[PDB]
Design a protein around this ligand. Structure first.
Ligand code: ZN
Length: 263
DNA sequence: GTAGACCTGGAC
DNA sequence: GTCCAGTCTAC
């Protein structure tokens, strides 16, 4: 789950929960709760509060209640669904919010990597994990200049730079690989080796790629999966030149690229 | 930069 | 049986 997928969840989930009041909060895997550390305090404070809105910051979902804000990160497999509280739960359900109208919001996560933090609204943006996030890619706050200031000071791979949420917030393995192919830049090259022209081109493709993915409802692996040039296509012909797509390891992640179209 | 952690189930 | 799928620590 990257920005496009999280933004899709935010849009579809909002009307299904806005205006409902919390009656109970049940937790089956405590490690997911990060703040307050004590699961009992986490549950108690939300009882009686009403859902007023749902926003997104980077790859995080921000549930807006009365006094508090619930900050949730899905990591690799987290997912949400709304259903009747009278039916048996599905496998791997670790947290459930029960509403006064008999419906409930369920959180499932097979690998158990997800996290949840609760803070008073006016403290959320000034505390971890939101405090140190970079700017939103689809906002004027993200420009070629911002990307250069960070790139010109480090020799780490350009892919490692784009995956750093403090540089820009929202890109993950799929959209970093896709943006670099569109820009014609190899993922393993030093960020400082990029020319001014290459930085402007990369910025342009990053905004175009992420924006297009949001419109298509994200990648299901949504319909953006039908528009991928390299992710998951190792061994198949490049859609632009016909050369076989390759896969290696960069910045500790599986990496896909075309040896002819990219640097 | 690069294995090891946190964790579980599918593909070969 | 062995390999593969967002972020933190540790040498
Ligand atoms: Zn190509």
């Amino acid at each position: 789950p990257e920005l496009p997928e999280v933004e899709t969840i935010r849009r579809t989930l909002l009307p299904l929960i806005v205006g409902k009041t919390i009656e109970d909060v049940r937790i089956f895997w405590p490690n997911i709760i990060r703040h307050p550390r004590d699961s009992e305090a986490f549950a108690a404070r939300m009882i009686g509060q009403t859902v007023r809105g749902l926003e997104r910051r980077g790859k995080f979902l921000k549930f807006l209640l009365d006094r508090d804000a619930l900050i949730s990160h899905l990591r690799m497999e987290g997912r949400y669904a709304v259903a009747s509280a009278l039916e048996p739960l599905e496998p791997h359900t670790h947290v459930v919010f029960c509403f006064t109208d008999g419906s409930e919001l369920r959180y499932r996560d097979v690998r158990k990597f997800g996290t949840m933090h609760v803070y008073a609204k006016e403290e959320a943006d000034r505390r971890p994990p939101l405090a140190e996030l970079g700017p939103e890619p689809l906002s004027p706050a993200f420009s070629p200049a911002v990307l250069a200031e960070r790139a010109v000071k480090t020799k780490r791979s350009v892919k490692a730079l784009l995956l750093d949420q403090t540089v820009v917030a929202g890109f993950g393995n799929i959209y970093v690989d896709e943006s670099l192919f569109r820009a014609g830049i190899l993922p393993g090259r030093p960020a400082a080796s990029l020319s001014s022209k290459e930085i402007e081109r990369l910025h342009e493709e990053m905004v175009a790629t992420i924006g297009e993915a949001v419109m298509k409802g994200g990648s299901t692996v949504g319909t953006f999966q039908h528009h991928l040039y390299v992710y998951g296509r190792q061994g198949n012909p490049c859609k632009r030149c016909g050369t076989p797509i390759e896969k290696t390891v960069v910045a500790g992640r599986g990496t896909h690229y075309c040896p002819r179209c990219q640097r």
